[PDB]
Symmetry: C2
Subunit: 1023 residues, 2 copies
């Protein structure tokens, strides 16, 4: 039972490497191995200092390893010490805030975006006094820095990209070298991605897969005389490191040594290191999903692939006796439940009687199931799969029967009548293959006659069907009540409150029950007749809103409502959508609130019990008759038990299967998947930690050689995330005191765009920071650590100005100041553009194509679009999906003006740019950011300046998480441009004028890209 | 910066030892040292298996290391595995559930009380299949077992006793050896304690301090030819271990080797191993103390020796700028607070203005302060110290003035009038030096004239003085309203509700204000006159109860009431005493509840704000006017920051100072403390963990060579305690199935005294356990781990009886079953005595002299005191203080009977023993159990049978915890017997007839002690 060994470094005969998230050291001479540091969190990189006495360590914390900071380990006394308190953001594909190199004096050089407006701006800083102070090198964003013959060697984006083999986009690693004390030249720019550069003798060694597989190559300090030193075919080499004589690297779980002199490669024999306990315990609530009410006031819930039946207090718990991956569990009978069990082959329907203990599984492979319901009489279930089919499955024979199949999307929204005769569902459809909108009509399946009926027309979005208890009327919701709401900032309107419930009597002649037509004035009777029922449709008298569920009751109707809200939090912070349960009294048409702060709602089969999840994250239950009697469902009294190796294999297979099944090109998917299956599955048994598993799943994901193959979420450690305290200020150690080198502020009147100190009436720039909460900070007291310890609270800060000015203030210590740094960067560029253009050119930056992109675009568009020229900066754009919306605005042509008796001219359209436009982009703009850059040029909006974009345009829409919560992504939607085809993928967008942003440019304090854009526009504006 | 190295074992050239709570391995050949197991919790012992391949490990978990279990470490593959799921109870002086030795076949033998009715019954078991099954050796309680020439060598109580140097009590370590298969002889029984026995060649090596200091000695396998092999004078040697050739041991933080051949001793050079981060972060609420209200709605609170001023939400927090050990903090003015600062020299008063930030400390040493208050005008503070003095301290000059000094106890109950003129306080006193009860009278000090006046007579206990706002009346409480309450089980009565409030008008002629005497009918006026004020006292019309505080308001009086409750939880589980705040309306005399579930209450200076601690442990604040507007006080938004080395130095110093100050014999205390200070203070810097510090503190505590020098509580690890699942059954692996070898039940009708399976109508004895919660248990499925995973919940257990009987039951899996095992043991002894005596002798067992002892003594006394004879078994008695109450009952002489017309004779006294009594005691009975054993003989109650008791009779009453919550105890009260003097201490009590309980007695299943007691009484009962 060997371990997965990774990321080594070497010094003499001593090699250090990672195993089980901890740092180990192996001595080649004695052959002994030892763990030198552990329990710090997940370590992914360790670097010896030049004299090999100390080691710089990068460690990640937070369940998903979303935070990182650095530590120093002293081999002499075994002293461990945290050096950075930045709580740098981290992702599997961009593990930032790390060791960049060591200068000629032996000082540590780090790379970090902690104090920058963008995560891609991983700037270089010399670390002084063990983290007391950080000195910027001003060489621009970089990953590695090497020093040879007195000059600086810079590696840009040279970190490994295991998730994207064959990457050839604009962000590929490149190497630059200094040629004259402050002048730099790009010496290594290959078609593919260069990573892990090191120097031995006078050659730069690095990795790249230009020939089809990862190998070690080398060039001279001029980027010439390319050489190939390896011919690996099993697994890609990774993480080169050197002591100046020999090179170390990891490959497929083993550590190897490359001797440049002999070109000899030798594997290091390390043997079995650690075998932790396989059987683990987990907190059920941390991986819970699919909670549902059962008879007898019992409840069912799924967690980490396991299912349970328990009382509400979680004291009497029964585990469903089925192996890994039960996806859904649903009430089947008095003491019975139906469930979906998944395997490597697909999903299957099963039944379990918790009273008798008899559990049965049917062999009919239903595909990949995303919804399942059971009729009230427990005779059949209804299932929906990714084939876009909705079917019934006889709970006795297991025989499935496809009801219908959509060609647009899954039929996950369905309901079954209490008498088990009708099945109503939303049917996604399109009039034509290339329609921009998918419509959805409710269809009704009559078990008797097996014939489908259209409940509603195909013109909009009808959903959430629900039959009344007597199975005589079909209620549902529609987004048909069109009525626009005005944008309060931009000239725009949108349909915000257009949801309305409708009802269809299943028996012709019978009226809308909510109309209260006197019974004596209605000729009753009539047999069921589902023909032309859409013509009989009638709305219920409820104000339009945004409803998601309708529950018809005897003399009232419950409705799940969602107040209008902003999307920022749900989009970036996973914040759940908040809703309220409303009660509509049919008799008086009076609407009241039943429950609020909801995020989900399940309804008992008999309509007597209601289960909800609230914004507080807890599950509650209450009688629909007396919502005051609410109880809290407890699931953590009983620990979740499982086997790491059983789960890892299950997880590898599912990751592997998802990558195959969701890859945009089906033909390709089959060949790729089969070719890589065993190669990586064979490494799974070497994995002992979730991080190990990650190293294996990601390399397999990279074999698809396509963008967007991500691994997000999951639980890798129990360590709380690192903390960082900020006040939007940069500190410089001057003598024995810290001085505020810079105090950030964007728009003073906006919220959260400035150092909290500004609210006290002074600009802290140039002030000395004497102490925080009575503790002196300075030469002998790390201010970053002090701020970290106060993060999220208000502390007394003593400031000293040049003179006799002294300040004693209670300052809010923020947990982050990225947005303040960003807005300040934006406003600075804005003033600079106005100043250099002499007031003729406007400026706008678009950070991404999501909700932030929309905010920042309009934030400046309303003030910047009416200058003679306009610069649209999309550098560092993180992508999203609103590129098309912003383009639509820039495409407006000013063709007129209103002339008022009083006031000034009003342009028409209001949203039109007045003059010439120019766009700036760089290698850090990507995805939807690629599409914007390509479209800007294609539509002739203006010239495109900068450097080639990221080149990743195969979108993702994840719909499944691993049992531990991990969200994997699969490049499932390949973008195709008219004329260019799929060619943007793995390449990017070339600007009309390429303007590099070299290290010497950063050294001189000049932004050549913005300067060219301003100048080019000034030129164009001459005539 | 070296480390404190401890508890080593040796095998060839390899030595393992503990450092920083982790396990390390050192190779004598290569000189290399390495950490082989870490992050498991706190390891205190590690033993090489015979072949030196596997290592057995004892690790502790739970903040106070109160739980323990064993693991196996396999250096071959680096596999770590838990072997036991007992969660054995552990204390620093009795770290039970450990490795006991290895049999000739190489199988692990463990010692544990996990499945016994007493913690001292650490029975031996051979471990099988890594914990799947445990086979009892049935040799009785033991610590170590060695094997020589086929015969078993047994060490009884042979663990180290660092907290008691020179121990010579009955529980001292002794060694027995097998002479004839199954027959044993005691070979090593010295006046002093023998610890850590090992065998080399044909000699038993061990440690003892018979010559005044710990040294290594040895004897032949016959216990003869005693030899002394060392002459240490610096630190006591500890933890001997051997590989059969050499002996390894720890001393003063270093690891040494003793060569029996050469008799040479060599120190192993290991060097600096590990230095963790010194600056740590702690959760404030976890070490919180003294919480108090300040003006402006601010709060003051002390935690881990630090003090803070903060708003209720804990968003605005200010740390008081003073070094370690702020003991108390009190409102001193508008933005000022007074505090007590403690140092190694004593306690001092200081003042801190949180607005300006100016802090001042006065140099007057106030001694050891236990109470502090400040007058409302902020001119002086009132302080109470362990000198029994109450004094004022000028807040301007710092000049202290002693008001009065009690010669009985501290004056901690005091109050200051609003006009700052009077100080009323409870004054402890005794009429004579040898009085059994300390009375308390209220005394009032007049600042004007500096004279003391008696407010109450000296006949009972008067307390909680409180002046009204106008400083015209003094209110207080007394336990003077004697009215007896009846005991519901025993003929007994006690004063439960005898607390009554009283009031004393400070102006003669003025009537009790609660009497509502009409003003027009009262001749008002008059000047203050405190003479004869006790004569003027008047009660207030509130029913008697149990009051702890009285707060007189304008038209009402608030009263803190404590409902009568049992003491068990408070006595054993630290449970807080629950109280309620009552409101007495003076006008109507109506009493209403203002707040319940309280555990503590603080009132602001202006009587407007109330702060309380509730049973939920949280601190709340509400306006006295609207108790509904209650807010929760948050203190954990901002982490506590401290330095480990600074804290460790402050704690050792305080531990040393407490040991000295409280030792019972002051003469001896000066010499001992000065002699031991440096020696242990020098080991402090070697400590890196709380466990390291404990080893040092305990060794220094043991220098007092007296009983009761303990170290309880404190925070040693962040690991959750070990869990164990129990159903009061003993399991035996028979083939591939576990059979219930025994099902425990005491009194079926009592609560919690039987396996929870009995509630389903069957006795599980003989039944086979098929599975638990669907999981099969047996030959390849450890039932103990399965139960551990279900502890605290109800699980489905399937059982099979011999036949066709099958049971499927939802069983409560308990967290512990010690009490069930105890009562079953007692009831079995009870039946055995009835049977063997043929219904002529009764039986009673007293497990301790605390609340449990009271419960169990009476639980049987009511049924067993009327046989012709009575056996009073005090074996294993844990001590406490009720021995005298039990003797009082046993002393009753039956001298008459009531003869009724109908029914049977009633004996007089009712609580009298009918006949002859005999007592059984052993080496596990001590403290108040020593006192009981001695008294039984002394008073001639009957014969004492068994073995010499523990011998620890110098009591404790701790009143101070270290900054981390640690409760240290100091032998402060030496018990003196008429005729025997102080002699019981460090010796114990000899029985009239000594009856050893040899290993072969346990092997044969015979209890020689109970048999002799039975036979002795049968004989005495002949005539």
């Amino acid at each position: 039972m060997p371990n997965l060994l990774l990321n080594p470094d070497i010094h003499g005969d001593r090699i250090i490497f990672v195993c089980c998230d901890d740092l180990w050291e192996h001595d080649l001479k004695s052959g002994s191995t030892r763990k030198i540091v552990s329990n710090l969190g997940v370590i992914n990189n360790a670097r010896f200092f030049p004299d090999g006495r100390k080691i710089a360590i990068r460690v990640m914390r937070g369940s998903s390893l979303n935070t990182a900071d650095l530590y120093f380990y002293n081999g002499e006394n075994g002293e461990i010490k945290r050096i950075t308190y930045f709580s740098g953001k981290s992702t599997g594909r961009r593990m930032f805030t790390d060791v960049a190199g060591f200068d000629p004096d032996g000082n540590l050089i780090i790379s970090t975006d902690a104090m920058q407006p963008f995560s891609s701006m991983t700037c270089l800083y010399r670390v002084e006094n063990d983290g007391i102070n950080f000195v910027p090198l001003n060489l621009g964003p970089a990953t590695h820095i090497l020093f040879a013959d007195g000059r600086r060697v810079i590696g840009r984006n040279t970190f490994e990209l295991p998730h994207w083999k064959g990457y050839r986009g604009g962000t590929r690693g490149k190497i630059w070298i200094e040629v004259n004390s402050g002048a730099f030249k790009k010496i290594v720019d290959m078609s593919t991605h260069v990573s892990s550069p090191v120097i031995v003798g006078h050659r730069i060694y690095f990795i790249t897969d230009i020939d089809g597989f990862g190998q070690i190559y080398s060039t001279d300090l001029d980027g010439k005389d390319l050489r190939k030193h390896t011919s690996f075919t099993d697994y890609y080499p990774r993480h080169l490191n050197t002591d100046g004589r020999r090179i170390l690297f990891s490959k497929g779980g083993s550590i190897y040594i490359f001797n440049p002199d002999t070109e000899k490669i030798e594997k290091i024999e390390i043997g079995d290191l650690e075998s932790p306990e396989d059987r683990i315990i987990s907190i059920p609530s941390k991986f819970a999903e699919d909670f549902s009410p059962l008879d007898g006031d019992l409840i069912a819930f799924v967690s980490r692939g396991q299912a349970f039946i328990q009382d509400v207090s979680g004291t009497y718990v029964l585990k469903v006796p089925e192996p890994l991956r039960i996806r859904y569990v649903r009430r089947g009978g008095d003491t019975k439940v139906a469930f979906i069990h998944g395997t490597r082959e697909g999903d299957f329907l099963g039944i379990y009687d918790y009273r008798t203990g008899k559990a049965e599984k049917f062999e009919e492979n239903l595909g990949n199931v995303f919804a399942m319901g059971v009729d009230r009489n427990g005779k059949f279930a209804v299932v929906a799969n990714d084939r876009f089919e909705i079917m019934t499955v006889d709970l006795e024979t297991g025989k499935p029967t496809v009801i219908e199949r959509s060609r647009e999307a899954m039929i996950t929204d369905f309901t079954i009548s209490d008498n088990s005769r009708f099945i109503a569902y939303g049917f996604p459809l399109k009039h034509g293959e290339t329609d921009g909108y998918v419509m959805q009509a409710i269809h009704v399946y009559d078990m008797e006659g097996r014939k489908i009926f259209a409940a509603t027309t195909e013109n909009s979005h009808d959903y959430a069907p629900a039959f009344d208890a007597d199975s005589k009327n079909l209620y549902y919701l529609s987004y048909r009540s069109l009525d626009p709401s005005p944008d309060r900032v931009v000239l725009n309107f949108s349909f915000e409150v257009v949801s309305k419930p409708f009802v269809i009597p299943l028996i012709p002649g019978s009226p809308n029950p909510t109309k209260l037509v006197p019974r004596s004035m209605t000729s009753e009777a009539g047999e069921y007749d589902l023909n032309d029922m859409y013509k009989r449709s009638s709305p219920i008298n409820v104000d339009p809103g945004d409803y998601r569920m309708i529950i018809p009751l005897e003399s009232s109707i419950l409705i799940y409502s969602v107040p209008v809200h902003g999307e920022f939090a749900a989009y970036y912070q996973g914040a759940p959508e908040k809703g309220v349960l409303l009660k509509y009294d049919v008799k008086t048409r009076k609407v009241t609130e039943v429950k609020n702060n909801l995020t989900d709602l399940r309804l008992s089969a008999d309509r007597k019990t209601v289960m909800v999840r609230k914004d507080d994250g807890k599950i509650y239950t209450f009688p629909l008759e007396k919502p005051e009697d609410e109880r809290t469902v407890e699931t953590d009294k009983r620990p979740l038990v499982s086997s790491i190796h059983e789960e890892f294999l299950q997880m590898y297979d599912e990751a592997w299967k998802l990558a195959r099944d969701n890859y945009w090109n089906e033909a390709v998917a089959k060949e790729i998947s089969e070719r890589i299956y065993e190669k990586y599955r064979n490494l799974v048994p070497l994995c002992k930690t979730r991080y190990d598993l990650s190293n294996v799943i990601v390399e397999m994901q990279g074999e698809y050689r396509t963008s967007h193959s991500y691994e997000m979420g999951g639980t890798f450690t129990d360590k709380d995330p690192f903390r960082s305290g900020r006040i939007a200020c940069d500190f410089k150690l001057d003598g024995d005191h810290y001085v505020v080198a810079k105090a950030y502020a964007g728009d003073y009147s906006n919220e959260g765009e400035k150092s909290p100190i500004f609210e006290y009436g002074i600009d802290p720039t140039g002030y000395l920071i004497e102490d925080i909460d009575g503790e002196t900070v300075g030469a002998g007291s790390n201010i970053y650590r002090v701020l970290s310890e106060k993060a999220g609270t208000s502390a007394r800060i003593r400031l000293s100005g040049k003179g006799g000015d002294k300040r004693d203030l209670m300052i809010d210590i923020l947990d982050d100041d990225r947005f303040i740094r960003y807005r300040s960067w934006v406003e600075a560029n804005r003033r600079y553009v106005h100043e250099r253009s002499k007031g003729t050119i406007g400026y706008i930056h678009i950070p991404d194509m999501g909700m932030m992109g929309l905010n920042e675009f309009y934030r400046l568009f309303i003030n910047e679009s009416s200058y003679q020229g306009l610069i649209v900066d999309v550098r560092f754009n993180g992508g999203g999906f609103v590129s098309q919306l912003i383009i639509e605005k820039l495409m407006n042509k000013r063709i007129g003006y209103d002339n008022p008796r009083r006031g000034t001219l009003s342009p028409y359209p209001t949203n039109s740019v007045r003059g010439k436009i120019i766009a700036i982009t760089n290698e850090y703009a990507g995805s939807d950011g690629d599409i914007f850059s390509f479209s800007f040029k294609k539509l002739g909006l203006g010239k495109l300046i900068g450097t080639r974009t990221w080149g990743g345009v195969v979108g993702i829409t994840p719909k499944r998480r691993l049992i531990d919560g991990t969200v994997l992504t699969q490049p499932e939607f390949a973008f195709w441009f008219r004329d260019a085809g799929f060619g943007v993928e793995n390449y990017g967008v070339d600007p009309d004028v390429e303007i590099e942003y070299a290290p010497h440019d950063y050294l001189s304090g000049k932004d050549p890209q913005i300067d060219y854009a301003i100048d080019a526009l000034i030129e164009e504006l001459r005539n």
